[PDB]
Design a protein around this nucleic acid. Structure first.
Ligand SMILES: [K+]
Ligand SMILES: [K+]
Ligand SMILES: [K+]
Ligand SMILES: [K+]
Ligand SMILES: [K+]
Ligand SMILES: [K+]
Ligand SMILES: [Mg+2]
Lengths: 105, 161, 48, 59, 130, 125, 133, 74
RNA sequence: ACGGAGGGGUACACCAGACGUGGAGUCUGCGGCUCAAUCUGACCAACGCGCGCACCUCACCAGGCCC
RNA sequence: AGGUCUGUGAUGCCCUCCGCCCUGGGCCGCACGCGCGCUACACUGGCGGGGCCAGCCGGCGCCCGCGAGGACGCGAGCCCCCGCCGUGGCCGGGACCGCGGGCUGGAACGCCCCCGCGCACCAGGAAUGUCUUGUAGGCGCCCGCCCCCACCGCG
């Protein structure tokens, strides 16, 4: 369960209703104008909602897009990323690694 | 440790002097003796410099000797400086004898060292270690660190004659 | 056709050669350390 | 063992906080329980300082 | 006068007098506050606000002619910040405590505003002199 | 109207003397107190009014510059008489530093080490 | 008159140490939080440890389970804006294990870079790791 | 009134001009310093060049042409 | 040029000492290992060296414009 | 036949047409062995409050904010003094990690502050380096590269 509200009362009340919540990176980046090439990301994602291969790693995820599958570039390939409730408040670059973990040898 | 190398009359009201005592070979023979001890005291490495604090350290070790021996602290200091310091050394090691200025040097050094080693990692303060060191060297007691060091040096000198 | 140099960044270079690396900006010189050795005679700097 | 303090401690012609600490476990009780012997002045001060204090027996 | 007396006497003898006559008396934020970003704990003597303000006014008296300012007072009470595995560096103290002090000292006519900064007014200058 | 100087490492003590304040603070209260006997040596080894302004340097250097300004100002009111040339010899026969300044100064750091003479650790493997 | 143990919050406080620095024995208390919890509830912060009455313990416990009510601020707290209740909690008991472990299991379900790096028992905070541990 | 600022990097010429302006009727020296490695690459013992440009200024208050001097009235 | 050849000088190279490093954690460089790439130079006189790598720098990888 | 053609419109001869630009990633990835350093192992110390002094040259006033830092305008640390702790890996030591609040910037993965968490380390084997007066050592301060940022180098 999200901070104090259940999924119905932040994903239906207001898109910015969560800002009194999530951390200072979120308030800073949203008290700043989002670049005009990721609004198109939402009028391609939320629009035609009824799998997207994307290329913007730094993009704050906010609740209205929940339960989606995306494929984010990490430099060599697109990696699928699912959307569970706790993903809200984070960026997309934390969910696809650009390095394979070392092993023995 | 002779009268010609222990300077009595040159002292001041506190040992601080700002003197260039080591610009010539034998100049420090006219350096006051309590100031020489003060200079040896601030020789741990984390305490290099910090002379203002060492002057207090020695200053409050003269109100302990006056309260135990009941005599003049400077006099007991002269006695300790004289008693310590090897008279014979070893340098195919053959025996040789030690000059006065080096006897004074090694004496002051070993008193400072004895207090330094006896105060580390202990509740007992370093000033009241200096009191023990000075009062026990001047007598001749085997508990003095300077006297045991002297005895070791003289034994090795004897075994190499 | 209309995307060429959209990225914004300082492209500070040496006033004499053109390199990007090791540029001195103190006092407003804006020349690199290799070119500063030989042009320093007339610019005015001298060793003392 | 307060009675020890009121007589056993009063048998040395000088005393220090560390000395009394090392005689019996008086770690910081030293500072408290010698000021009592100072207000009634069985001992007084001669050389004092924030870090060290030498106390000499009035008697 | 003020310059004569041992500086450590006047400060701690006027801070005890700071409890009389309803002078600057301490506000509530005094708890749970470090006097600086370099300190790692709060002061332990509970009269610390009193002594601090006694000190800051004795600081204002010595600069009789010209004006001090608040930011340049936090610089006066600076300390070095330790325990970081890097070499230690100095930090400016807290301007909120000092500004709180000087605000209440501008009352009771002990200080007067200037072009830039506070100044020791004739009243309060007379008091410290007496 | 007597004007006199005193110098230590970077400290300069300017003394004005008329028939004893240090930076407006009374001399008896010069804060470094275990060295209080040093700033009073010429008095208690040998009044009038003197005014001292000392700037630059550190605590000990400032003390040692006033120790020279004070003793040099009480030598510019006696003149042309045997006292002028004898009190000087009495002052030096205790400490010549009382009359003549100490020339020593900081030496410059040279590249390749933290200090003027200390270099950096050398390794071979 | 004193005791030589306060087996409180399941932690054995020794006594004979100063109570200021005695409270730091409890994992969750610091010297900061302790010096803001004693004076806020009228308790002498430094005389001893084992001379604290029963009523004084009651006052300390009543200010331990609710800091905001007695005026201890949010910025002086440790569970700020938690990811379980959106509230400024105060986790001052040996049951800090559950929340710290939940912050791991959430990562384990979410599969984040932080969680995947924490699994392998590696540095996680940007530090270099070529140095041969 | 009138002000003349004069600035120059060679003390001799500056002094000549300053002398011969008094034939007709704080500003201290500040040093531009640059320290740079002597090598073009970074191989060898690390040695350093210390370059220095010293300037001089005078400010004449009022109520010869030399190439290298700078004068502004303001 | 060299000599476990002789002779004559000399330097904090030694003597008398001081302060260290090598052991702990940690910053940085190097080798190895890994990797789509982890760009490359140097082995007393290489290894906080080639003046501070989010982009740029940029030499390297996955793609994609234009002459 | 140290280094440097990768600092240049210095440059021969080979080879590429590997030029210029945009988005994202790497150069920082880690079982491990080495070089230069930083911080310690405490009482000649740690902490709380006060006092006061530099040089390379150099802005700070007023409100908010625990702080970090913001909106709005104009021309030194050591050390000293007073207390506290009391030989207990303790109030030594501060790595690692968990929430928060900020700054830079198109963008944190960069840096700062707050509460909490409290590693290893008890003076270091075989070896090994530097240094003779304002010198060793201790203490801090400034500039350079620099959107941000020193455990670095020049002072
Ligand atoms: K020079
Ligand atoms: K006890
Ligand atoms: K106690
Ligand atoms: K090199
Ligand atoms: K190097
Ligand atoms: K070249
Ligand atoms: Mg790049």
């Amino acid at each position: 369960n999200f901070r104090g509200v259940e999924v119905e009362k932040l994903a239906t009340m207001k898109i910015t209703d969560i800002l009194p919540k999530l951390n200072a990176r979120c308030r800073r980046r949203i008290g700043k104008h989002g670049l005009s090439m990721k609004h198109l990301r939402f009028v391609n994602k939320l629009r035609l909602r009824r799998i997207v291969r994307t290329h913007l790693r730094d993009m704050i995820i906010f609740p209205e897009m929940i339960g989606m599958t995306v494929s984010v570039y990490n430099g060599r390939q697109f990696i699928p990323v699912e959307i569970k409730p706790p993903m809200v408040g984070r960026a997309l670059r934390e969910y696809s690694m650009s390095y394979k973990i070392v092993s023995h040898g | 440790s002779l009268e010609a190398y222990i300077s009595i009359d040159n002292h001041s009201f506190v040992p601080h002097s700002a003197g260039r005592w080591s610009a010539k070979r034998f100049r420090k023979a006219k350096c006051p003796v309590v100031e020489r001890l003060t200079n040896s005291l601030m020789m741990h490495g984390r305490n290099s410099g910090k002379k203002l604090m060492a002057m207090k350290t020695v200053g409050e070790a003269f109100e302990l000797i006056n309260l135990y021996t009941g005599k003049n602290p400077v006099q007991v200091l002269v006695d300790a400086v004289a008693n310590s310091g090897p008279r014979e050394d070893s340098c195919r090691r053959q025996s040789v004898d030690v000059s006065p200025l080096r006897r004074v040097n090694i004496g002051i050094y070993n008193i400072a060292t004895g207090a330094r080693k006896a105060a580390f990692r202990k509740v007992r303060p370093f000033a009241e270690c200096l009191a023990e060191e000075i009062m026990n060297a001047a007598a001749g007691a085997d508990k003095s660190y300077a006297i045991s060091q002297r005895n070791s040096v003289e034994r090795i000198a004897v075994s190499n004659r | 056709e209309t995307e060429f140099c959209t990225h914004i960044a300082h492209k500070r270079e040496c006033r004499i050669c053109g390199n990007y690396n090791s540029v001195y900006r103190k006092y407003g010189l804006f020349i690199c350390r290799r070119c500063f050795k030989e042009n320093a005679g007339k610019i005015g700097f001298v060793k003392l | 063992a307060m009675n020890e303090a009121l007589k056993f401690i009063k048998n040395s012609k000088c005393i220090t906080h560390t000395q009394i600490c090392e005689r019996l476990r008086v770690s910081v009780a030293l500072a408290k329980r010698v000021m009592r012997q100072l207000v009634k002045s069985g001992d007084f001060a001669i050389v004092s300082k924030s870090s060290r204090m030498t106390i000499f027996k009035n008697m | 006068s003020v310059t004569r007396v041992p500086a450590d006497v006047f400060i701690n003898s006027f801070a005890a007098h700071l409890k009389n006559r309803g002078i600057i008396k301490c506000p509530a934020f005094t708890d749970y506050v470090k006097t600086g970003v370099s300190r790692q704990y709060a002061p332990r003597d509970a009269d610390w606000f009193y002594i601090k303000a006694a000190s800051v006014i004795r600081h204002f008296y010595i600069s009789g002619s010209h004006s001090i300012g608040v930011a340049g007072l936090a610089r006066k009470y600076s300390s070095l910040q330790k325990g970081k595995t890097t070499p230690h560096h100095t930090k400016r103290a807290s301007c909120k405590v000092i500004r709180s002090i000087v605000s209440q000292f501008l009352g009771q006519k002990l200080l007067i505003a200037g072009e830039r900064g506070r100044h020791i007014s004739p009243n309060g200058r007379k008091m410290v002199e007496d | 109207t007597v004007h006199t100087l005193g110098k230590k490492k970077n400290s300069v003590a300017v003394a004005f003397v008329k028939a004893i304040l240090v930076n407006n603070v009374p001399l008896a209260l010069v804060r470094p107190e275990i060295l209080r006997t040093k700033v009073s040596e010429p008095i208690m080894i040998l009044g009038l009014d003197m005014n001292i302004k000392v700037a630059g340097g550190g605590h000990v250097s400032q003390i040692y510059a006033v120790r020279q300004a004070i003793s040099r100002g009480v030598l510019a009111s006696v003149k042309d008489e045997a006292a002028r040339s004898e009190l000087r010899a009495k002052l030096v026969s205790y400490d010549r530093q009382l009359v003549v300044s100490d020339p020593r100064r900081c030496e410059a750091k040279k590249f390749g080490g933290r200090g003027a003479r200390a270099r950096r650790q050398k390794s071979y493997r | 008159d004193y005791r030589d143990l306060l087996r409180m919050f399941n932690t054995n406080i020794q006594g004979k140490v100063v109570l200021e620095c005695a409270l730091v024995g409890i994992k969750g208390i610091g010297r900061r939080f302790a010096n803001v919890a004693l004076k806020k509830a009228n308790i002498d912060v430094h005389k001893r440890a084992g001379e604290l009455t029963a009523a004084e313990e009651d006052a300390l416990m009543k200010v331990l389970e609710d800091p905001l009510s007695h005026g201890i601020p949010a910025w002086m707290l440790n569970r700020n804006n938690d990811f379980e209740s959106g509230k400024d909690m105060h986790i001052l008991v040996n049951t800090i294990a559950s929340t710290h472990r939940a912050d791991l299991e959430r990562l384990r379900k979410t599969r984040c870079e932080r969680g995947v790096r924490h699994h392998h028992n590696l540095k996680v905070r940007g530090q270099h790791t070529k140095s041969t541990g | 009134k009138y002000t003349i600022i004069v600035v120059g990097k060679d003390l001799k010429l500056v002094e000549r001009y300053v002398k011969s302006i008094v034939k007709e009727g704080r500003a201290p020296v500040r040093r531009l310093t640059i320290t740079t490695r002597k090598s073009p690459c970074g191989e060898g013992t690390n040695t350093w060049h210390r370059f220095e440009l010293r300037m001089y200024k005078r400010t004449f208050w009022v109520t010869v042409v030399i190439p290298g001097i700078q004068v502004t009235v303001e």
